[PDB]
Ligand binder design. Structure first.
Ligand SMILES: Nc1nc2c([C@@H]3N[C@H](COP(=O)(O)O)[C@@H](O)[C@H]3O)c[nH]c2c(=O)[nH]1
Ligand SMILES: Nc1nc2c([C@@H]3N[C@H](COP(=O)(O)O)[C@@H](O)[C@H]3O)c[nH]c2c(=O)[nH]1
Ligand SMILES: [Mg+2]
Ligand SMILES: [Mg+2]
Lengths: 230, 230
């Protein structure tokens, strides 16, 4: 029931968060269940930056980092500020096409052409849920690597032979089945992307408590001293 | 000589920033002149959030925020997390077309159609310099408002009758004549966007010292204690 980074009780994090806002009705506040505080998310992103930094410390050409609009902007901002190897960064807009046999990510022809040319290309997304998105991107850019703050089920992803070899840098896994997340850049029907904490609106209290129990112990065991230079 | 937010000697902020990096050579470190620490930039962004929050406290419909790729991703992340009114967020990767008579911003037909329909549209940019970008967007979306962390010369921008009425929210102005900024999302020829502190690579030590004196004066008089809820 306490933030694993600051030590502030979640009730206090939320009392501060919800004080006199103009973007949520008092009656709606209870609908939002905090899964991870913004500070906890920042720790996860820093830990991910740490691993990418170690991986690319000797790279001889800038890495191509590419983030998918729009939600990943926040995570990308929390990740990139801690990276210490050369890279370029750009964002691309893709559309999800739900076919009768599979869901596919449709890129701008030019964007895709450019990416397929780079040796080191890392797709940044804040959340890998069903994995259909990265599964599609993967089959279009076979050498692409993935960097995601949250991954619902890594094992499920690795089950696919196509992704079994793909390098993935992620902050935390697994995420609760039956959840629906908003905040941390993810929209609530277009709104609240800037609600920095990661909230859920579909889980039971017990499920939220269990998720935090596991997240908290994971964060307390992290060693990211020095990663943040600011 | 110190960060106007943390009180830490800039010399130490920089030594911490540059210790064991893999994205700059030792001989190149002196090329970067610190203009504003990441913390100072965060204070300026919080101030713009505070002002936007007051302006839109009674908005009846979601405000349309449009951030200009690529550089605005960091500032947008630092601004949106503190906004307390409803809004949607979109990034536009418009293309700059340098004509023989003027430079114009080319939008995706659909993106432009959508924006021109919304009553409240705010363009988010980390830095408005020559102003050609917003000047173009302005004549295409005449009702667009601007929210920029840094502005080279506000006085100069208002010189244009077309922009003389455009509502502008900004963190700080003016920026040093002849400066070239990198960091805080701005690229150094594609690289270093994640260097969160705002650096310049053209100014003399005395020019930089003078800029920080003025920035310091502004930040110390800043009233944002409370804007950050995280
Ligand atoms: N608001 C909110 N968005 C998503 C998404 C959106 N779909 C993207 C890719 O999903 P997937 O892995 O299922 O293909 C995510 O990166 C995210 O932007 C998945 N799950 C959720 C969720 O619970 N909440
Ligand atoms: N690296 C680095 N980029 C810019 C820019 C980029 N150009 C864009 C628009 O500029 P302007 O106002 O001149 O049209 C900005 O959004 C910014 O990303 C302006 N000035 C600088 C600078 O000094 N340095
Ligand atoms: Mg996503
Ligand atoms: Mg979404």
């Amino acid at each position: 029931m306490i933030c694993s980074v600051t030590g502030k009780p979640v009730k206090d994090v939320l009392s501060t968060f919800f004080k006199d806002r103009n973007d949520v009705l008092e009656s709606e506040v209870k609908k939002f269940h905090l899964l991870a505080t913004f500070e906890e998310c920042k720790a996860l992103a820093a830990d991910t930056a740490r691993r990418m930094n170690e991986y690319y410390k000797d790279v001889a050409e800038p890495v191509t980092l590419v983030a998918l609009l729009t939600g990943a902007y926040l995570y990308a901002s929390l990740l990139t500020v801690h990276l210490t190897f050369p890279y370029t960064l750009h964002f691309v807009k893709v559309s999800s096409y739900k076919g009768t046999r599979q869901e596919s990510v449709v890129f701008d022809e030019e964007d895709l052409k450019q990416l397929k040319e780079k040796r080191e290309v890392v797709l940044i997304d804040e959340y890998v849920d069903s994995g259909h998105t990265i599964f599609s991107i993967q089959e279009q850019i076979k050498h692409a690597k993935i960097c995601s703050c949250f991954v619902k089920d890594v094992d499920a992803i690795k089950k696919h032979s196509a992704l079994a070899d793909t390098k993935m840098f992620y902050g935390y896994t697994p995420m609760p089945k039956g959840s629906w997340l908003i905040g941390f850049g993810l929209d609530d029907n277009g709104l609240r992307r800037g609600w920095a904490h990661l909230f859920d609106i579909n889980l039971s209290e017990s499920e939220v408590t269990e998720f935090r129990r596991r997240l908290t112990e994971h964060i307390k065991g992290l060693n990211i001293n020095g990663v943040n230079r600011y």
